[PDB]
Amino acid sequence: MLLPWLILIPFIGGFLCWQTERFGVKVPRWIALITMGLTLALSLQLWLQGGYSLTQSAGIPQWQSEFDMPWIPRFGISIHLAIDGLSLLMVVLTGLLGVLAVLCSWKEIEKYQGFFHLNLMWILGGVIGVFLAIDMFLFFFFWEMMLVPMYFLIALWGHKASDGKTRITAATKFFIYTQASGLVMLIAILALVFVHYNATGVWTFNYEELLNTPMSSGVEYLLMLGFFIAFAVKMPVVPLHGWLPDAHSQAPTAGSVDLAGILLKTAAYGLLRFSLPLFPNASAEFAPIAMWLGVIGIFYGAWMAFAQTDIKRLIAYTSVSHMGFVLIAIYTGSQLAYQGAVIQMIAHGLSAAGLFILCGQLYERIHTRDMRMMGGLWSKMKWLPALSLFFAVATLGMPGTGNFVGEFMILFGSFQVVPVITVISTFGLVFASVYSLAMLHRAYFGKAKSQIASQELPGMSLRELFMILLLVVLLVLLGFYPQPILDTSHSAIGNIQQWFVNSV
Amino acid sequence: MNMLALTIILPLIGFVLLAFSRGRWSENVSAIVGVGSVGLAALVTAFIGVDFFANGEQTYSQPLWTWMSVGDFNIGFNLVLDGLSLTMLSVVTGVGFLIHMYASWYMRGEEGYSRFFAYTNLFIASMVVLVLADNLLLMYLGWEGVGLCSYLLIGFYYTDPKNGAAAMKAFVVTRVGDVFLAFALFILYNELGTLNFREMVELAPAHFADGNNMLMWATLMLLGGAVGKSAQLPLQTWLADAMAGPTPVSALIHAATMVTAGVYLIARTHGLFLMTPEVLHLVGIVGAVTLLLAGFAALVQTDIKRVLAYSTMSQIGYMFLALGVQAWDAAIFHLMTHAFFKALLFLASGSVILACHHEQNIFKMGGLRKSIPLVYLCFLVGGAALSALPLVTAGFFSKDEILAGAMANGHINLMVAGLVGAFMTSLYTFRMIFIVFHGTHSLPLIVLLILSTFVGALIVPPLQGVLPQTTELAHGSMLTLEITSGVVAVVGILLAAWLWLGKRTLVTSIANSAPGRLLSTWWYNAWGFDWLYDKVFVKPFLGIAWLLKRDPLNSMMNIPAVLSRFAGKGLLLSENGYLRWYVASMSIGAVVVLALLMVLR
Ligand SMILES: CCCCCCCCCCCCCCCCCC(=O)OC[C@H](COP(=O)(O)OCCN)OC(=O)CCCCCCCCCCCCCCCCC
Ligand SMILES: CCCCCCCCCCCCCCCCCC(=O)OC[C@H](COP(=O)(O)OCCN)OC(=O)CCCCCCCCCCCCCCCCC
Ligand SMILES: CCCCCCCCCCCCCCCCCC(=O)OC[C@H](COP(=O)(O)OCCN)OC(=O)CCCCCCCCCCCCCCCCC
Numbered sequence A: 001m002l003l004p005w006l007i008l009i010p011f012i013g014g015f016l017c018w019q020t021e022r023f024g025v026k027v028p029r030w031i032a033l034i035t036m037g038l039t040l041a042l043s044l045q046l047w048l049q050g051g052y053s054l055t056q057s058a059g060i061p062q063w064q065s066e067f068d069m070p071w072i073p074r075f076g077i078s079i080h081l082a083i084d085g086l087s088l089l090m091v092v093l094t095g096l097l098g099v100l101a102v103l104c105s106w107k108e109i110e111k112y113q114g115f116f117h118l119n120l121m122w123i124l125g126g127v128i129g130v131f132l133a134i135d136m137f138l139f140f141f142f143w144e145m146m147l148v149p150m151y152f153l154i155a156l157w158g159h160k161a162s163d164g165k166t167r168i169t170a171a172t173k174f175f176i177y178t179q180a181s182g183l184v185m186l187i188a189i190l191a192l193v194f195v196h197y198n199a200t201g202v203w204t205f206n207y208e209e210l211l212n213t214p215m216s217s218g219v220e221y222l223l224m225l226g227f228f229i230a231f232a233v234k235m236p237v238v239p240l241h242g243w244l245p246d247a248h249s250q251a252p253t254a255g256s257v258d259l260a261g262i263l264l265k266t267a268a269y270g271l272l273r274f275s276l277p278l279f280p281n282a283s284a285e286f287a288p289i290a291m292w293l294g295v296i297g298i299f300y301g302a303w304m305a306f307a308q309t310d311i312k313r314l315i316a317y318t319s320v321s322h323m324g325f326v327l328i329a330i331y332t333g334s335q336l337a338y339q340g341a342v343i344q345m346i347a348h349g350l351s352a353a354g355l356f357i358l359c360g361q362l363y364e365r366i367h368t369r370d371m372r373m374m375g376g377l378w379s380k381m382k383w384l385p386a387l388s389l390f391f392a393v394a395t396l397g398m399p400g401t402g403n404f405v406g407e408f409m410i411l412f413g414s415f416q417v418v419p420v421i422t423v424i425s426t427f428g429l430v431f432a433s434v435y436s437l438a439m440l441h442r443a444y445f446g447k448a449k450s451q452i453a454s455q456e457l458p459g460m461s462l463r464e465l466f467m468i469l470l471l472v473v474l475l476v477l478l479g480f481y482p483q484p485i486l487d488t489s490h491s492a493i494g495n496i497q498q499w500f501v502n503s504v
Numbered sequence B: 001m002n003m004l005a006l007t008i009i010l011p012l013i014g015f016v017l018l019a020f021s022r023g024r025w026s027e028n029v030s031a032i033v034g035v036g037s038v039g040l041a042a043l044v045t046a047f048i049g050v051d052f053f054a055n056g057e058q059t060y061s062q063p064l065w066t067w068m069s070v071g072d073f074n075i076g077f078n079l080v081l082d083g084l085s086l087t088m089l090s091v092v093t094g095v096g097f098l099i100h101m102y103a104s105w106y107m108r109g110e111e112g113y114s115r116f117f118a119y120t121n122l123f124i125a126s127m128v129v130l131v132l133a134d135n136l137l138l139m140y141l142g143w144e145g146v147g148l149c150s151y152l153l154i155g156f157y158y159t160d161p162k163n164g165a166a167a168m169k170a171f172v173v174t175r176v177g178d179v180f181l182a183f184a185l186f187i188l189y190n191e192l193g194t195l196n197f198r199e200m201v202e203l204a205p206a207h208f209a210d211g212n213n214m215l216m217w218a219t220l221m222l223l224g225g226a227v228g229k230s231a232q233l234p235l236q237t238w239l240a241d242a243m244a245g246p247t248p249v250s251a252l253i254h255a256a257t258m259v260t261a262g263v264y265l266i267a268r269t270h271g272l273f274l275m276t277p278e279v280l281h282l283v284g285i286v287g288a289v290t291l292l293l294a295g296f297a298a299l300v301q302t303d304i305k306r307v308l309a310y311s312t313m314s315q316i317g318y319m320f321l322a323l324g325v326q327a328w329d330a331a332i333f334h335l336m337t338h339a340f341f342k343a344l345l346f347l348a349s350g351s352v353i354l355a356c357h358h359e360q361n362i363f364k365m366g367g368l369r370k371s372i373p374l375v376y377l378c379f380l381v382g383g384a385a386l387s388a389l390p391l392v393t394a395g396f397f398s399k400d401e402i403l404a405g406a407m408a409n410g411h412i413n414l415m416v417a418g419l420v421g422a423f424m425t426s427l428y429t430f431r432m433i434f435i436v437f438h439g440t441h442s443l444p445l446i447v448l449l450i451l452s453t454f455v456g457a458l459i460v461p462p463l464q465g466v467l468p469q470t471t472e473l474a475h476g477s478m479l480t481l482e483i484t485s486g487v488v489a490v491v492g493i494l495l496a497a498w499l500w501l502g503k504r505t506l507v508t509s510i511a512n513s514a515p516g517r518l519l520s521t522w523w524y525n526a527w528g529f530d531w532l533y534d535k536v537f538v539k540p541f542l543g544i545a546w547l548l549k550r551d552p553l554n555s556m557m558n559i560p561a562v563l564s565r566f567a568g569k570g571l572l573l574s575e576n577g578y579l580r581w582y583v584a585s586m587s588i589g590a591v592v593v594l595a596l597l598m599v600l601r
C-alpha cells in the first residue's frame, strides 16, 4: 500500500515545487529536499519492515509487498506494483541519489527553478515506477515517461558554455535512442500478450500471468530480442552506447541531473526481471552473444575513456565498461554472479555519483572540462583532488570499496560458468586501472598547463563536502561489509536464477 | 595475542588522522602520529610474539566478521597467526618503524609531510592485512592495498611528471600481476570451494586425485601474481623505474613490504606448490634467471639507487631460488636479513643524497670516505652483508642456507647460478662502493648496522611447524660449500678492488670497446625488457586509443540519421510547387495502382 505513495510523493512534490515558486525564489529546493527525504524514508521503512534477510526463495512470483488497481480494463491493464529485495535496493538507491541531486542543485537559484525541480522529481518518480511496475504496459509507460523531463533538462537547462544547438542535438539523440528502443519493446510486449491471448483466451498485461506462455523458439527469440534492444540502449551496450557521453557532456552542469536521470541502471534490473523469467530458453540461447557484447563493451569503454580530453566523457565511458561487466554477469546462471551484479550496480551508482559531483565542482571552480588545460591541481585545491583520487580508486575496482566486491563476485561466478570470458574481463580490469590513473595524472598531478590552474581556488562548501563524504562512507562500508545488501537481494536473485536454470 | 586487529587498526587510524589533517598540523604532531602508530603496531607485534612463544608456538586465529556469503561462497574476514605470519609481521612492523623514524628526520621541510606519513601508514596496514590474512581474498585485499600505496608513494613528488609516469608504470605492471593472482583465486574457488589456506591444503589431494591440470594452472597463476609483486621475470620492469620517490619509500618497498609479498605468497601456499613439482621448479628457474639478469644489469648502472634496485631484484631472485629448491626456511631467513641490510643501504644512500646535492652521477662524486666517515661505514657494512662476506654478515649465513638447500635437493644448475650471482653481487656492490667512496649516529641506522652483522643472523624465525624442514646436507658437503662461497665472495671483493679502485685503465678499456659498449647498452636498459614491453603493449594500446578517439561505433549508429536526412532532401524535390506536376504525379500513381491491381489479380 506504500508503493503507490513511493511513486506519487515525487510527482506531488514536483508539482508543489512548481507551484511554490511564487512564495519565494529559494523555496522549491526545500520542497524537493523534503519530498525526496520522504521517499527515502519510506523506502528505508519498507526495508526495515520487509524482513528480507529472513526471506527464503519460493519461486516467481514472490513479492514482499503488492498493490493492484484496474487502469485500462479493456486490455486487462492495471496499475500493478510489487516490491521484493532487488526492487527495494533499487528504490533505496534512487531515493538516495535523488536526495543527492536535490542537494547538488542547491545554491543555483534562478528563474523557473520550480520547473527544474518539477522535472527532477518527475524523473525520480519515473525511475521508481520502473522499479515497481510488474505489468507490461505500466512498466513501458514508466520506461518512456522519464524521457520528456530528461529531454527538457538537457536541452533547456543544459551546459551553459555550449553552443545551444549542441545541447538540443544531444538531447534529441538521447530521446530518439530511448524512445525507439522503447517502441521495439512495446512491439515485443504486444506480441507476447497476443501469444498468451491466443493460447488462453483472456487479455492480460500482468507479468505473473505472462510467465510460462507456450510459444515456439523463434517467436520467443524475437520477443527476447525486442526486450534486449530496449534494455541495451539504456544499459548501455555497444554500439547503442553513443547517446550516453553526449547526454552526460551536455547535461546541466550542476551534475545533479546526471544522478537523477542518467546515472541509475534500470536496464540491468529490466534484464533480470523481464528477460530471464519471461524468455528463459531464448536468453539461454542468446547468452554467448550478450556475453561477447559485454566483453566488447568493457574494452571499448576503457579505450574510449582513455582517449578523452574531457572529464565527463571519461566518466561516461567508465560507466560503459562497468555495465559491460554487469551484462556478462546477467547472462550467466550463477547466483553468485547475480549478487555481484547487484553489488556492482549499487557500487557503480555510488562511485559514479561521487565522480560526477566532483567533476561538477571542479568545473565550477576552473570553468573548463579540458584536461589539457588543467594540471597540478593537488597543490591548488583543498578537498577535491583527494576525494577525486578516492573515487577514481573506487572505480578502478579497489578492494575496500564495493566496486571490487561486485566485480569480483561477478568474475567468480562467471569463471564457474564461462572461463574464457572471465579471463578477458579481468584484463579489462587492468584497462580500468589504466584509464583511472590516466585521468588522475592528467587532471591533478604534474605542472599547471594553463593560467587558470596556476591559481588558488576556493574550497568546497560544507554541503558538497558532506555529501561527498557520505558517498565515501557508503562505498567503504559496502566494500568491507556488503552482507546486508546480499541478504536483502538473496531471495529475489535466487528466484530469478532458479526460474532461469530449471526451465532450460 | 588477540591484538592482530590492533596491529592493523593502528596504522589505519594513523592514515585516517593524517589524511584528514591535510597538512594543517605541525610537523612534530604529524610525525608523532605517523611514527607512533607504526611504533605502537611494532610494540603490539612484540607483545604478540612474546605471547606466541609463551604458548607452544600454536597457530592463533582471530575471526573478525564474515566478509561475504553467497551460497557456498563464504569468504571470511579472519586473521591467522603462525610462525610465518609472525616473522613477516615482525619484519614489516619493525623495519617500518625504523624507516618511519628515519623519514621523520629526513622529510623535514618537505611539502606533504603528513600526506607522506598517511601513505606510509596505509602501506603498513595493507602489508599487515596481506601477511595476516586467513584466506586468499583478504590476502588479495592486502595485495591490492600495497600496490595502491606503492603508486601513491612512488609518485610522491607529483609536480615532476616523470615520477608520475614511474608510479603509473609500477601500478599497471603490478595490476597485471594482480590479474594473474585473481585467475589463481578463481581456479582455486571453482575447484576446492574455499580460499582458506589450511582448507585448500586439506582438500587439494582429495579433489585432484584424477587430474592435476587445474591445480597446475592455479599454482602457475599464483607464481604469476608473485612475480608481479616481487618484480621477477617477466614482470620486473617497474622496480628500476620506481626509484623516483623519496629514499624512505624505496627502503620501505625494497626491504619491508612490497617485494617480500611474492615470497610470502609462495611460502604460504606451499602445500599447493608441493603437489605441482614442475611449477615449483619453475619458481626456482625464474628466481635463478632473475638474479642472474639483475646481477648483469646492476654492474653497469651509473646511479646508487638503480644499483640498489637491481640488487633488490637479485636478492628476491635468491629467495625465489630457495623456494624452488624447497628450502623454505632459508628463503624466509634471507628475506629477513635482506630486509635488514637493504633498509640500511637505502637509508645510507638517502643520507648521501641529502649531504650532496642535485643527484650527481657516481662518476662525479669520489673520495667521499673522508667527507662522510659514518655514512661510509654504514654503506660498507650494508655492502658486506649484501655481498655475503663470511662469518661477520647475516647475508653470508642466509645465502649459505639457500645454497645448502639447493645442494641437498639435487639442484646443481641452480647452485652454480647462485654462486655466479654471489660473485657478481660482490662485484657490483663493491664496484659502486669503490667508485663512489674512493678517488650523526641516528638510532635506526645503528639498529640496522647491528642487525646487518651476525647479530641479525642469530635471529631464527619460528618456522618449524609451518614450513617443512629442509633436508640436511652432509657435514663435509656443507663445509666445502661454506669454503666455496667464502672464497667466491672474497675473490669478488678483490677483483672489484683491482678493477675500479685505482687508475681504472682496464675497465675503461673494456667499456670503450665496441662489444663493451654493446653489452653496457644492453644491460643498462634492463636487458631490453622495457623496450620490448613498450613496443608490444604500450605502443599498440596508444595506437588503438588514437584510432578510437572519435567514436566509430557511434558513427556507424549515426549513419541511419544521415540516410534519413538524404532521403528527406531527395523526397522534397517532388514538392516543386507546380500544379501540372501534381496532376502528373496523380496520374502516375493511378497507373501504378491499376497496374499493381492487375498484376496481383
Ligand atoms: C531508414 C533506414 C534505417 C532504418 C531501418 C533499418 C531496418 C530496420 C528493421 C530491422 C529488423 C528487420 C527484421 C528482423 C526480424 C526478422 C524476423 C524473421 O525473419 O523471422 C523469421 C522467423 C520467425 O520464427 P519462426 O521460424 O516462424 O518460428 C516457428 C519455429 N521457429 O525467425 C526465427 O525463426 C528466429 C530468427 C532470429 C534471428 C533473426 C532476427 C535478427 C535480429 C537482428 C538484430 C539483433 C541482432 C543481435 C543483437 C545485437 C545487439 C542488440
Ligand atoms: C584497510 C586496510 C588496508 C588494506 C588495503 C586497503 C586498500 C584500499 C584503501 C583505500 C583508501 C583510499 C585510498 C585513495 C584515497 C587517498 C586520499 C588521500 O590521498 O588523502 C590525502 C589527503 C591529504 O593530502 P594533503 O596533500 O596533505 O592535503 C590535500 C591538500 N590540502 O587527504 C585529504 O585531503 C582528506 C581525506 C580525503 C579522503 C581520504 C580517504 C577516504 C577513505 C578512507 C577513510 C574513510 C573514512 C573512515 C570511515 C569509513 C566508514 C566507517
Ligand atoms: C582490512 C583492515 C582490517 C579491518 C578493520 C578496518 C576495516 C575498515 C573499517 C571501516 C569499515 C568497517 C566495516 C565493517 C565493520 C564491522 C562489521 C560488523 O559489525 O560485523 C559483524 C561482527 C559481529 O560478528 P558476527 O555475528 O560473526 O558477524 C558476521 C558478519 N555477517 O562484528 C564484529 O565482530 C566486530 C569486530 C570489530 C571490528 C572493529 C573495526 C574497527 C575499524 C577501525 C578502522 C578505522 C579506519 C577506517 C577507514 C580505513 C580506510 C578505508
Ligand SMILES: CCCCCCCCCCCCCCCCCC(=O)OC[C@H](COP(=O)(O)OCCN)OC(=O)CCCCCCCCCCCCCCCCC
Binding pocket: A427, A430, A434, A437, A438, A439, A441, A442, B165, B168, B169, B172, B173, B176, B234, B235, B533, B534, B536, B537, B538, B541, B542
Ligand atoms: C610477452 C610475454 C610476457 C607478458 C608479460 C605481461 C605484460 C607486461 C606488460 C608490461 C608493460 C606495462 C607498461 C605500462 C606503462 C604505464 C605507464 C606509462 O608509460 O604511461 C604512459 C601513458 C600515460 O597516459 P597519459 O596520461 O595520456 O600520458 C601523458 C603523457 N604521455 O600511459 C599509457 O600509455 C598506458 C599504457 C597501457 C598499457 C596496457 C598494458 C596491458 C597489458 C596486458 C597484459 C596481457 C598479458 C597476457 C598476454 C597474452 C598471453 C597469451
Ligand SMILES: CCCCCCCCCCCCCCCCCC(=O)OC[C@H](COP(=O)(O)OCCN)OC(=O)CCCCCCCCCCCCCCCCC
Binding pocket: A299, A419, A420, A423, A424, A427, A428, B180, B183, B187, B217, B220, B221, B223, B224, B225, B227, B233, B234, B286
Ligand atoms: C614465468 C613466470 C610466470 C609467468 C606468469 C604465469 C604464466 C602465464 C601464462 C598464461 C598467460 C595468462 C592467461 C591465463 C589464462 C588461464 C585460463 C584458465 O586457467 O582457464 C581455465 C579453464 C578451465 O576449463 P576446463 O575446466 O578445462 O573446461 C573443460 C571442462 N573440464 O580453461 C579453459 O577453459 C581453456 C581455455 C582458457 C582460456 C585461455 C585463453 C584466454 C584468453 C587470454 C587472453 C590474454 C590477453 C588479453 C588481452 C585483452 C585485450 C588487449
Ligand SMILES: CCCCCCCCCCCCCCCCCC(=O)OC[C@H](COP(=O)(O)OCCN)OC(=O)CCCCCCCCCCCCCCCCC
Binding pocket: B299, B300, B416, B420, B499, B504, B506, B507, B508, B510, B511, B516, B517, B519, B520
Ligand atoms: C662456472 C662459472 C664461474 C664464473 C665464471 C664467470 C661468470 C661471469 C662473470 C662476468 C663478469 C667478469 C668480471 C670482469 C668483467 C666485468 C667488469 C668490467 O670490466 O666492467 C667494465 C664495464 C662496466 O664498467 P663501467 O663502470 O661501466 O666502466 C668503467 C668506467 N668508465 O663492463 C661492460 O661494459 C661490459 C663487460 C662485459 C664483460 C664480459 C661479459 C661476458 C658474458 C656475456 C654474456 C652475454 C649475454 C648472454 C649470451 C647471449 C648470446 C651470446
Ligand SMILES: CCCCCCCCCCCCCCCCCCCC
Binding pocket: B035, B036, B039, B040, B042, B043, B046, B086, B087, B090, B091, B094, B095, B097, B098, B336, B447, B459, B460, B461, B462
Ligand atoms: C612508540 C613505541 C615504539 C616501540 C618499538 C618496539 C620495537 C623496537 C624498535 C624496532 C626494532 C626492529 C627489530 C626487528 C626484528 C625482527 C625480528 C623477527 C623475528 C621473527
